[PDB]
Amino acid sequence: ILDPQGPFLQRWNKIFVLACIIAVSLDPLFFYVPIIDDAKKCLGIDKKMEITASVLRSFTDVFYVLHIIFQFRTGFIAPGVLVEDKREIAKRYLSSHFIIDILAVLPLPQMVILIIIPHMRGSSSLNTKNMLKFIVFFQYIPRFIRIYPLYKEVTRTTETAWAGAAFNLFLYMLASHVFGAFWYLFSIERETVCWKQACERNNPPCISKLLYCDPETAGGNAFLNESCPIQTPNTTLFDFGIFLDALQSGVVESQDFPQKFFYCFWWGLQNLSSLGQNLKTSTYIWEICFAVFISIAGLVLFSFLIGNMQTYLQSTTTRLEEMRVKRRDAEQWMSHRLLPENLRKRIRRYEQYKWQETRGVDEENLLSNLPKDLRRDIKRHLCLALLMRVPMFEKMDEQLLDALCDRLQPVLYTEESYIVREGDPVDEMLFIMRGKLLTITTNLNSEYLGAGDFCGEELLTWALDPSSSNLPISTRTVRALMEVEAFALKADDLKFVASQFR
Template sequence: MMNPKQNKYVRFEDWKSEQSSFSNDHKSSSNIRPFHVRKPSVSSLMRSTNRRIERGSERISSRRKPDDFHNVTNKLRKDQSVASKKKVLDPHEGQFLQKWNKICILVCVFAVSLDPLFFYIPVIDNKNKCLHFDNMLKISACVLRSFTDLFYIFHIILKFRTGFITPSSRVFGRGELIEDSSAIAKRYLSSYFIIDVVAVLPLPQIVILIIAPNTNGPIILATNEMLMVVVFFQYAPRLFRIIPLYKEVERTTGFFSGSTWGGAIFYLFLFMWCSNVTGAFWYLFSIERQEACWRSACDKIPNCSSDYLHCGGNMNGNTLLLNSSCPLLQQEDIKDPNDFDFGIALDALQFQVVEKRKFLTKLLYCFWWGLRNLSSLGQNLKTSTFDGDIIFAICISITGLILFSLIIGNMQKLLQFDLVRVEEMRARRWDVEQWMSNRMLPDSLRLQIRRHEEYKWQQTKGIEEDSFIQNLPRDLRRNLKRHLCWSLLYRVPVFEKMDEQSLDVLCDRLKPARFTEMSYIIREGDPVEEMHFLMRGAVSSMTTNGEETGFFNSVHLKAGDYCGNELLAWVISPHSSSSSLPVSTRTVKAVTDIETFALTADDLKFVVSQYRRLHSKRQLQRTFKYYSQQWRIWAACFIQVAWRRHCRNKLEKSLREEEDKLQVALAKESTNAPSLGAAIYASRFAANMLCALRRNNATGTKSSPTFSLLLHKPDEPDF
């Protein structure tokens, strides 16, 4: 049997790696041979084997614990989320997506504005009575359309990389962002993918560049109908795709209707765009009516086939017959029932708009025609009995009516915000005027109140800033106050030494205040209730030291400066009374309309009480004493008194020296008759005494008793 030492040896060989365990077994066994002569028994080997099996099972079970499994899965999810964040974009936080949505909606509007260019490609040759295409316009329209389609394609690719928030997760907060690529693709494929693909198909390019050049005869005459069908077939999805983009941009940034002028420009552009589309369709419709007249005339002319109405076909000399069969007559001039009534297309044919001429002239005329008829709701249209003519006129009337209702309704809604503000201002002004009349205030005081109310309204637009800021979340309110007030607090040398936490508390307790020109913020001798930090404007700070005769000090403060530092000195001073506020030593008057942030005594006392744990108290005391107005005035007066004392002592010393010289000169005289030297010293002494008396009278020796008041030393700040 094994002894306890052998069991201890087996317990000692517990390694984490099987390989190291195996190697160490051999090493240890070789090392203990001198100490353990007897070989291990079978039972001891079995027990050691069982222990090793148990340890191995414990290791395996520990690796399969639920906590470790969750840690591994969380790590994998974190890695997947990090990898997905590199590919999936957040639609609510990404600046790139917001900018791209703005660009995309502008490109979409530009694209639908370019699509009517395809309607201007067919051109009538009135001389040869045939139809052909404008090659330059055809190439330009296809290139521009292909360029805008590239943005559509990139937008489709980007949609597969844009995450979304499930509606079920919007119960609390902003919801959960889905970043799974398969879920994003499935959602997009089931929503707007088909519409985007149909909108980006190059169908007009195929009709113009492939079908039309490779066909002849009646097929090319049908190209107009085919082009009209294709463009209108894609117009619906291309317009429908703008609507969600518009809502997304409007919801996130208010890019189009954020202001009254922005909304007015948007709806004006919408009206002009509809006029452009209407004019382009009228152009193509006029060509269709001319072609219909030629076909009806060709059916009545022998050996005339409508297959050759395209340029390049053989008309067999039927040009004159077609010209006489399709006269351009007004409706009141039509006498023969067989004469063709062109209806609303008569203007385009009479003014030769459908013939080849400058494209800009053609575009402007068609645009003017559409704008004029949409504005008049189609009241001036002279339609024929042709069904297409009537349907087109009905569509113009309905479209114009809808556009006018949209423009008037939305403009009224946009202007209503400004009108509400104006009415609120008028109502408040009326209430203030009634109150001033009931109180029988003088005109000068009424003028000051009116100016203050007007200035406050101009700055806030009727918004109560204090209540608005206080209703914000604490973190957002702190960030806002930090942005507005952080630089102002750093102008105060004492606050500059504070930590960020104390400055955040100060920023959170600042309150906005406004003063009009020539109004007093603080008066000398009044208690100081607030400390003001200037954001805008200029003030004048002056003092007479308690209306002291001959004493005046004035400084000019601008944006970024502060006033009311007596309150800070009162809060810091250990001998200050908690019941009585400090008395102002200066008068602060607004030179212009100013805007400040105010800090009350209670708020300042709270912050300073939390601030007494600073390390460098001596440096803070020196900083406070250097920038304090009380300490500066005391230092200036102290220097003046010291200088005057020095001058007086110097004068007294010189007078004593002169007197000593006179005494010495008088003592040397041995005779009764006065000498010349004694007379000179006596005259000098008298002259010096007169000069000293005059100097003392000029400087005002009566003011010397006031030096005791000026030299009153302020209390030492205690932090």
């Protein structure tokens, strides 16, 4: 007995939503089963298409009875503890989704082909076209409201930035295949409607068996190329409208399936992405309603694609938008304050240096939203080896240096940048990660601070004497020579660490 967030179901019920897109990608294959033999002017059956659609539907419908038996041993919880007991798992399923799952999985086209049509009354070709049209209609509803609750089951738990656009592009291909096989079947039905109407006014006499094919009967009603003209059209006799391209190309006579599939799929793709622009309909109402439905469905898909894409694109540009709004803010604040050009280009230098190092990421906000031992292991990797180069800090344990790694903040310094000047109070104690720093004094000798060296060691002796609250006056003037990365130790954060050291 399992629960819906258990690892077996949560990896197996993603294959079920996949096999329900495979299932609706094979239901229009039964529309390619009726055929027209244009020599004898008869409606026929593509027998090998009839087998191909029946076993492709079966092999995806013995994959959803496996969903039915995996909902008899699923997990209800409450109105914190799951229910592992049957006869209430198998009573809410039988009150919520069991019949829709069993009306969607019944082999209704495969059983009407094997059982019902060879024992029906009339022509086998007309019965096959009429049963497979309506059974695929009447099973079209539970095969789509079985995917509504199974998607509500996975909105309570794939995703990438582009997955909404890739599923959108697949929805073009599925709808183009559905609309084109509908167009195939409606083209065959409009030609047989022409044949029936021409036979009910039989100036030339018509025999009604011979509209339906039968290999025992050779030859059919030969006058039907006059009353139902296709290769040269006469819309006074019959306007075929948007179905004339299917009857002129001979796709309704071919028994070659990739020939038949690709011509009709491309009709669906051409007219969905055109929003029905080039559909020259006749005055027939249901042909117009088909073209209206193609126009609306393509109108709804294209707008989704443009959106699913501008979403992919904008997902990938936030920190970069946020930098552009800050660079344009550093502009027109300078030239509203009328800053001199030596001040403005130092501002542009720091904001570009902060951008190429951090990329908009606030490191302290990123680390504070981590757990206290994971944040400790990061800051002991970054900051602890820098603190071991101060000749006093080895005297502390792994309880006070862990207070110091917690209080080290990363700072950035461009070139020409002054860290401190002689005479200023010392706020920080730096621990240099990168860059070279020239320090001078007039009290002369010029020292150099590289990676691993530390500035501000006047401040430790101030924040150890248990002393004045005014900061010690800098005896050195420290200036950066290259881009400097460092870790800053503030005065009061060092003053806290002084109280736990005696």
